[PDB]
C-alpha cells in the first residue's frame, strides 16, 4: 500500500488525541479503591436498613410518647442513620461509577484502540526491518562518544518502549461495554475487573517525578542537547555508515528508517500519556504542541547536520557462487514502459538465477505510485553473469546522468565474455512528477578511459575458478523504492565477487515532502512479489473473487487457522478451484510460490494434464515453497 | 474460590462487615433492653417489637 | 498505639473545628430534645427529623475528623517525640565513634 | 559560553583512557538530566507568565477557581520537589563535582 511518512503519522496521532481529548469524564474520580465487586452485596444492606430506619423514624414522628424513651429511640435513630448513610454513600459511589463512567470510558477506549492499530500497520514493516539491521551491525572500534549516547539514552528508551507496548495491548484486552462489568453474575468481576484495575494502576503511575522526565530527555538526547551535545542521531549515522552492514537500501535509507522508528515511538508514547490522563480524572493537557515541536526539532536535526553527509549508493546485499556459460552471447533488456521508470532490482536463484525488475509511474517530488507498479522476471541471469572455466571481461563504470533525469532502460551485453551494458535515461519533472520522453541520454561504454577519452579500455576481468563465481544475490533497491539517477557495476575480482550499485533520488525525494511537512507517499521495498496471475491470490477479505470452493469443507475463513491472515482451508474433501488456463501462454516457463500449512493438494490441471501437483509435504506452521 | 468474586480484599470486606455487624448489634441491644423496660401501649410496643 | 500517623490530617484546625463541633452540638441537642418532647404535628415531626438527620451527619463527620486530630495530638505526638528524642542522643554518641 | 562547549563536542573523539569518562558519566548523567528537566519546567513557568495578562485583571474573587487552575502545572511540579528526590539529586551532583 502506502507509508504516509512521519508527518502524516504525527497528524494521525494528533487526530486520535483530539478525539480522546474531548469526549467526557464527568470527573468521576476513577480511583481503584472502590471495592466494585459488592454492588450486589451493599444493595441488600442498604434496602434492609432503609426499611428499618424508616419504620423507626416514623414511629418517632408519631410523637405522643414517653420523653426519655423518645430520647433513647432518637439516639438509636442517629446511630442507624449514620451507619446506613456511610454504607449507601459507598454504594452510591460504586453505582454512579458503574452507570455513568464505565460506559463512557469503555467507548472512548474501544475507539482509541482501532485507530492505534491502524497507525501501527503504518510501521509494522520498518519494525522488522530495524530488527534485521540490528542483527547485522557490529560496533567494533567504537569511541567513547558511542558509550556516551548509549548510557545517556538506554533507560529512557527501555521504559518508553515498555509502556507503549503494555498500554497498547491492554487497550485491547479489556472487556467492552457489552458486559458493562455490570453486577450481572460474577467472575466477569474477577477477570475484567483485574484487567480494569491493572489499567487503572498503570495509568496512575504516570503522574510523578518520572515519564514526563523520560520522554523529554529522550527527545533531548535525540536533538543532541545533552551535557556535550552529541545527538544520538549522529552517532547512529556513524555506526551505520560503517561497512559490513551491506543490506538493502543506502545510508540515507537506513538512517531515515531509524528516525522513523524513534519518532513513531515518541508519538505513540505521547498518545499513551494523554490516554492515561483522560482515563484518570481531570486536568487535560494538550500535549499536541509539545509533540509537534519535538518531532519538528528532531527532523530539523536530521535535515541540517546529518543528511548532507550520506550516500544514496546501494549495493546487492549478498553474493553467490554459480557456474555460468561462455559459448553464449546473452543479451538482457530491462526497459520500463514509456511512461514508467526503473525503481530497483532483485536477484533470486532458488528456482533459478533470476533478476527481477520493478517499474512504475511517478508522482511529484520523486514519489512513486502504488498501482502502475509491475514486477518483471528474467531467466538465466547467471549465464550473463557467470562463466564456465574462461575469463570474463567486465567493463566497470559509475554511469550517472544529470539531475532531473531518471534511469529508464538498462540493456546488458555479454559478447565473448565481455560484459558491458547500456544505460538510458529520460528527463523528468519533480514539480509535476512528469517524465519527459523526448530528452534522453545514452551510455554505451562502461569505463573511465572512455569517460575521459571515448576510448575502449579500463574494464576488469575475472579468471573463472572451478566451483563458480560469486555472483550478486538478493535485492537491488533502496528501502523505499525510488527512481535512480546513478547506476554501475564494481566487480572486485581480487576475491572473484561482482557488485551492482546505483544512486538514488531518495534525498531529494523526501527533502521536498517530508522534512517540509507535506503529503509524503513512499513505498517500503517489497520483500516478496507484488502481482500474480492468480487474481486475489492474497485472499484475506473473506471473499474469493475468482476463487471458488465446490465444498463447504473448503471455506474462506479470514481466521482459517488464526485471525492474523487467511489461508484457504480444506479438510478431507475441501477443494478450492480457479480457472487459470486463459492466461498462461504455451511453451513458457513459470515459477510458483505459496505459503501452506498442513498437507494440501495442489493441481494445475486442464482436466487432461496436471502441469504441476504437490501433495506430499506436511507443514505445521505455513512453510512457503517455490517450484 | 470465594475470591472468585473478590481480590483478596476478603480482608477489606471482612473488616467492613465486622464493623457493620458490631454497630448493628450495639443498636439492637439498646432496642432490646428498651423493649425489656416495656410499660407502653400495645401498638407502641408491638411496632417496636416488629 | 497504632495511631496511623497519616499526614493527611489538616492538623492546623484543632482550634477551628472545635468551634464548629461545639456550636453544632448545641444546636442538634436543642432540636433533638424538642423532637423528643413529642406531642407535635406528625408531618412537622417528619420534617424536623430529617433536618436532625442531616445536621447529625454533618456534625458527625466533622467531629470524627476533629477526634482523629485530637487523639493524635494527645496520645501519639508525646510518645513519638519522646522516643525520637531518645534515639537522637544515642545516634550522636555512636557518630562520635567514627567522626575521626 | 554554553554554545562554545559544542565547538569542543564535535572534536572530542578521544580514546585510550575511556574507562574514566565511562565511570564518571555513567555516574553523573542522571542527576544532570533531572536538573535540566526541572529547569525547563521554568520555560513552562514562562508559559504561565504568558497566561498572566489573561487573568491579572479579573483577580476580583474570580481567581478563586480561575487562577487556582491555569497554574496547576506548577502546583504539581513544586510538589515533585520533596520526599527523597530532586533535592537528593542536586546534593549528590554537587558531591561528585567536588569529588567527595
Author numbering:
A (entry chain B): 27 to 653
B (entry chain A): 52 to 101
C (entry chain D): 52 to 151
D (entry chain C): 152 to 251
Share the article's original sentences.
The Vip3 (vegetative insecticidal protein 3) family proteins from Bacillus thuringiensis convey toxicity to species within the Lepidoptera, and have wide potential applications in commercial agriculture. The Vip3 proteins have molecular masses of ~90 kDa, and are secreted as soluble proteins that form tetramers in solution. They can be proteolytically processed by trypsin or insect gut extracts to yield products of ~65 kDa and ~21 kDa that remain closely associated in solution. Vip3 proteins are proposed to exert their insecticidal activity through pore formation, though to date there is no mechanistic description of how this occurs on the membrane.
We first examined the structure of the wild type, full length Vip3Bc1 by single particle cryoEM. The 3D reconstruction of the tetrameric assembly of Vip3Bc1 with a global resolution of 3.9 Å resolution was obtained (0.143 FSC threshold). Each tetramer comprises two dimers formed by conformationally distinct A:B monomers. Each monomer of Vip3Bc1 consists of 5 domains. Domains 3-5 make up the C-terminal portion of the protein, primarily composed of β-strands. The interchain interactions that bring about the conical morphology and impart the C2 symmetry are formed at the interface between domains 1 and 2 on each of the monomers, with the rest of the complex not involved in oligomerisation.
